[PDB]
Amino acid sequence: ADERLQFTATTLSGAPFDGASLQGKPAVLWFWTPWCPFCNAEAPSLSQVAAANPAVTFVGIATRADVGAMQSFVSKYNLNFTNLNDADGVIWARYNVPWQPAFVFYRADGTSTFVNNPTAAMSQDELSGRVAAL
């Protein structure tokens, strides 16, 4: 929320990205790793919900994998939004780690809600409703 978004990063494509650009608009952070079965179950839903909600800015944040594996996952699931190679877990630490998948749902006013459930993948219906609520 608010100042935690003040990070910089590198995308899987190698481009710089500034988290501060997310301030003041509805956004979703999604912390994933490519080998997690829950992340793999959620990825089609991220792809569809992001596509259907273009005025919400989605940013995936991947760690604990090589960049090629990250890229294969984005390609396989058509994740057409920024994905960050958080190679050393610094952004993950900022948002307090602990494992994947995790969502942060930001309103434009800076408030947020998190979902970090280890037992199940979030359904598309649930994700669509959380994104609409922003």
Overview of the structural elements:
- The PDB classes it as oxidoreductase.
- It is a single chain.
- The protein is 31% helix and 23% strand.
- The protein has 134 residues and is an alpha/beta fold.
- The chain has one domain (1-134): Glutaredoxin, CATH 3.40.30.10.
- Helix 1 links the parallel strand 3 and strand 4 (57-62).
- The protein has helices spanning 37-52, 67-77, 90-94, 124-133, and strands spanning 8-10, 16-18, 27-32, 57-62, 82-85, 102-106, 112-115.
How many angstroms does the end-to-end distance come to? Answer: 14 Å
Biggest sheet statistics:
5 strands, mixed
Overall geometry comes to: globular
Order of helix and strand elements from N to C terminus? EEEHEHEHEEH
Main location: secreted
Subcellular location: Secreted
Keywords: Disulfide bond, Redox-active center, Secreted, Signal
Family: Belongs to the thioredoxin family.
Summarize the structure.
With 134 residues, this protein is of the alpha/beta class.
